[PDB]
Design a binder for this molecule. Sequence first.
Ligand SMILES: Nc1nc(=O)c2cc3nc(NCCN4CCCCC4)[nH]c3cc2[nH]1
Ligand SMILES: Nc1nc(=O)c2cc3nc(NCCN4CCCCC4)[nH]c3cc2[nH]1
Ligand SMILES: [Cl-]
Ligand SMILES: [Cl-]
Ligand SMILES: [Zn+2]
Ligand SMILES: [Zn+2]
Lengths: 368, 368
Amino acid sequence: RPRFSFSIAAREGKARTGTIEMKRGVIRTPAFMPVGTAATVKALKPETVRATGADIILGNTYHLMLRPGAERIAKLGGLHSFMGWDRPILTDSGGYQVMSLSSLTKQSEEGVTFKSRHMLSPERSIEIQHLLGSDIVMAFDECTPYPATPSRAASSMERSMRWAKRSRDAFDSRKEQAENAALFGIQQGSVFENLRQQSADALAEIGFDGYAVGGLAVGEGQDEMFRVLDFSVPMLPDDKPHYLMGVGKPDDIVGAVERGIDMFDCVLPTRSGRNGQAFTWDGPINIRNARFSEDLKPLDSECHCAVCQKWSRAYIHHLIRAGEILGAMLMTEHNIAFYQQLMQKIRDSISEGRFSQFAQDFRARYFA
Amino acid sequence: RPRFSFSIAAREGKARTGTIEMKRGVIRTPAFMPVGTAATVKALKPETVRATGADIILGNTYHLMLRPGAERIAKLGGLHSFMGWDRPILTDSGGYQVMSLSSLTKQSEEGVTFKSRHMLSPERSIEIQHLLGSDIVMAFDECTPYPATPSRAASSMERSMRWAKRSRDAFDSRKEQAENAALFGIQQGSVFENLRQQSADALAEIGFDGYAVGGLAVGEGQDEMFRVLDFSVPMLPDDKPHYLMGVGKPDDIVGAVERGIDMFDCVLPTRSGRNGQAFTWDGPINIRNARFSEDLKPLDSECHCAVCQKWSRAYIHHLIRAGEILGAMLMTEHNIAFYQQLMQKIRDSISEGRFSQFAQDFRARYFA
Ligand SMILES: Nc1nc(=O)c2cc3nc(NCCN4CCCCC4)[nH]c3cc2[nH]1
Ligand SMILES: Nc1nc(=O)c2cc3nc(NCCN4CCCCC4)[nH]c3cc2[nH]1
Ligand SMILES: [Cl-]
Ligand SMILES: [Cl-]
Ligand SMILES: [Zn+2]
Ligand SMILES: [Zn+2]
């Protein structure tokens, strides 16, 4: 198996479908990555994550470096062995989470020091991801807060680009990592076209295996996110994967694919599952609602998941009302399966040249 | 398949091993029943409960009548369909739980009224268990508090015996229930030999499919519980199953089998699993302890369960420390599997006439 090979099998407008081949497996694109921040996709065994159709999951440098620790995970045989997931794992670099979750931060050209006292930098981030045994390593960046003035966005993006080069160099210096893993760069520039262009130029000059659109899904809303994607995605190399970080709701995913995105991750299906929200083709439902107390239908009428084959809305309603762990388990498995089925329909429709019609049909029903 | 047929295949001293055949499946005895109070064995899919080796699970009249409701479960197709467990279910009658969990109770010859305002009586308890579709129905009784004076124990036991007859009559009046389910009586009498005898006599005169030893595991401790079992179990009909309610720790189970008990239920493996206690052949361990943070061994070195085949102590330690649902799932599956393996070893050793040696070996190692 190759270290990293991206093939585009079909296109429709800006949308693409294909595969990334890696040593630990094949990733079908457009891809959705379930989030496994604490070395677990919450409430699911890895075998169940795979059963839903997931090809790859997301982990986090920031969380794992704090608990259980990067050196510790390496001593225990690496993240794959530790959590029992043998397929590809993409790890975020800490760039976002250090600023989102830390009680106090000190930012400088060297990197970021923070209180959980720890340090992250391009070099340390890449080293941690090496110790974890990540398959797709993210460059260490800064997710510019929204909104930002053009000047603040510019200085932030420029620092990220210097950090991108340091990330590239650190990754390339570690022979085993360079041989077995892939490195993605992260575009910044807030909502500004000229900065997005400068960022894309800088990343392409360095050269990466894939390119993430960073700095979005940070409160700007779908209209603005789509506006920025409209000009930002075409700036990235066409022949490499495009990864939209932290997106999103089903309609966000469809629109982002229409704009050239190949990869997604989001806590929504897992988190909202635990909170009682189930995704269906007719839009989300809250299973806690009294209207479901005697509803014998599955969560979704078409869904092929094991939950929908076996249990009723009424039962899951009871479980979630009761605070039962099995409620969280079943809701989560269903939601992750729903997300994977969405990605499968997207892939199939692009392959068949009917993605535009799929997007239209999807929205008409989902938002009816 | 028969409604109810108990066969004893082998004996050693007071210990027996055999099978109960019922319409929904065979129960190997001595049997351990995982507890499923809220219509779920906490943190496990029914398929996982079955995978551990369980033949039958326990449900509760008291909890289910309050949430989601007995009529509601019947409208939804019965408890088996509702929760997705198609094998036998034994339901406790509410006799214990109404007094243990209710905020206020009023006790009379008719039954018990309580605040969650509801009513339980022999007739209502049997009706609820009918609506649930229970396979083994428990008589509605009173679990005498411990300690009790001989006179208080006597009056309590006598009321339970009158309630046992009312339970028998209510069950027999419902043709579908009498055709498809079994009814067990519950012996009371606290710690007093003469009262236990009077209770056994009363139950045998009425006639039941099985006989539970009630009124124990209520704070008396193992020495006293065993002392009472020594004289109480031989009073019950030899040719019917003997069920010790609410027991217990592994050593309690072994000693109770040595005293003629065929059936057990306890929340210990599930509850203590969630709390970080794992059962092993060398005694329980608390997986949260720092000593496990880098321990690559499975929870137990011999255990055949899926958890022990795949994950380390170190990983489970991390999960439980982090409050992750998967931690609860894995600990629970392992503990329930451990309990089932204990029952299998008990069954095999009695079958082979080496149970005494097994009990000795078990204790020497478990308590080393
Ligand atoms: N290294 C790095 N750089 C980014 O610019 C970035 C940008 C991101 N934007 C998000 N948004 C997450 C949105 N999420 C939606 C569901 C509820 C929780 C928040 N996650 C991100 C992660 C990111 N990681
Ligand atoms: N109907 C009925 N009658 C009883 O005499 C009875 C006696 C019981 N004794 C227990 N003890 C439960 C012990 N358990 C150990 C693990 C922690 C929680 C308490 N459960 C019982 C249930 C019972 N149910
Ligand atoms: Cl997210
Ligand atoms: Cl118990
Ligand atoms: Zn489903
Ligand atoms: Zn095990």
